[PDB]
């Protein structure tokens, strides 16, 4: 009458408030910077003729900000393919231009979506 030990989710957490016996529900969530790939909860049911979890255990995947904005007359220093939580991008102005504003911005997360911390700098001639 009991389901199998749920185990663990890398970069995440499994909440077990009512045990793992028939009828219990467990809930899943991810550490900051990650988001759930799969079900948000799982229930110990009986199906076929055996007690087992209703959902496969989900995984936690990294949240990425969108590609950093390009700016006129400037370049991004060593731009990467993907930027995750708290990773930064730094800009440089081209020959004959001077930078106004913060030289770097970084990837923030809210509601499982990545967003840049603010606007990129201006390169003025």
Domain boundaries, the chain: 1-62, 63-123
CB 55 within 8 A of CB 38: yes
Q: In terms of DSSP bridges, do strands 50-53 and 74-76 run parallel, antiparallel, or are they unpaired? A: unpaired
Q: Measured between alpha carbons, how far is 19 from 90 in angstroms, rounded to an integer?
A: 48
CA angle 101, 103, 105 (to 5 degrees): 105
Class of domain 1-62: mainly beta
Provide the experimental method for this PDB entry: X-ray
Q: Show the tokens assigned to 75.
A: 């370049």
CATH superfamily placement of domain 63-123:
Complement Module, domain 1 (2.10.70.10)
Q: Measured between alpha carbons, how far is 56 from 114 in angstroms, rounded to an integer?
A: 26
CB 79 within 8 A of CB 94: no
Q: Measured between alpha carbons, how far is 64 from 87 in angstroms, rounded to an integer?
A: 10
Helix and strand tally (H, E) in the chain?
Answer: 0, 12
| 5: exposed, middle or buried (Cβ count in 10 Å: 0-12, 13-18, 19+) | exposed
């Amino acid at each position: 009458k009991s389901c199998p030990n749920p185990g663990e989710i890398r970069n995440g957490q499994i909440d077990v408030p009512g045990g793992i016996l028939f009828g219990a529900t467990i809930s899943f969530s991810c550490n900051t910077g990650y988001k759930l790939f799969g079900s948000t909860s799982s229930f110990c049911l009986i199906s076929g003729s055996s007690v087992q979890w209703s959902d496969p255990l989900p995984e936690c995947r990294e949240i990425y900000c969108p590609a950093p904005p390009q700016i006129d007359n400037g370049i991004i220093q060593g731009e990467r393919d993907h930027y995750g939580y708290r990773q930064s991008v730094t800009y440089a102005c081209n020959k004959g231009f001077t930078m106004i504003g913060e030289h770097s911005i970084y990837c923030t997360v809210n509601n499982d979506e990545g967003e840049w911390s603010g606007p990129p700098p201006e390169c003025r001639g």
